Amino acid sequence: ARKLVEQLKMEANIDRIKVSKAAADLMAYCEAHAKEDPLLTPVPASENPF
C-alpha cells in the first residue's frame, strides 16, 4: 500500500479554498453568461435554427 499512501499524501498537500468562495465564483459565472444561454431565455423564433 506504499503507492496508495504516497497518492494520499500527495492529494493531502493541496490548497483548498473555502466553499463560500467557490460557490460565489460559480454563481458569478452563472449570471455573467446568463444572456448568452439560449435555454434559459428562449431566443426569438427568427434566430432559432430549430
Partner 1 sequence: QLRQEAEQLKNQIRDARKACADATLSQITNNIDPVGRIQMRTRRTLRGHLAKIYAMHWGTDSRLLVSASQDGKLIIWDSYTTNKVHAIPLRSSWVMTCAYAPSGNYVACGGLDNICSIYNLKTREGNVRVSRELAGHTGYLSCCRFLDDNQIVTSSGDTTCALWDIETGQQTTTFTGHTGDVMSLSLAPDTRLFVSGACDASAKLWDVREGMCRQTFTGHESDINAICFFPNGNAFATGSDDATCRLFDLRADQELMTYSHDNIICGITSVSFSKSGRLLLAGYDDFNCNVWDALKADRAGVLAGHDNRVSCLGVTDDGMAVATGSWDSFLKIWN
Minimum gap (Å) between residue 33 Cβ and partner 1: 4
Minimum gap (Å) between residue 23 Cβ and partner 1: 4
DSSP calls for 3-49: HHHHHHHHHHSS-PPPHHHHHHHHHHHHHHTSTT-TTTSPPPGGG--
The position carrying cell 493531502 is 12
Instruction: Give the footprint of partner 1 on residues 23-42 (CB under 8 A).
Output: 23-27, 29-34, 36-40, 42
Decide whether 39 or 46 has the Cβ nearer to partner 1: 39
**Three cell numbers, residue 29:** 459565472
Minimum gap (Å) between residue 20 Cβ and partner 1: 5
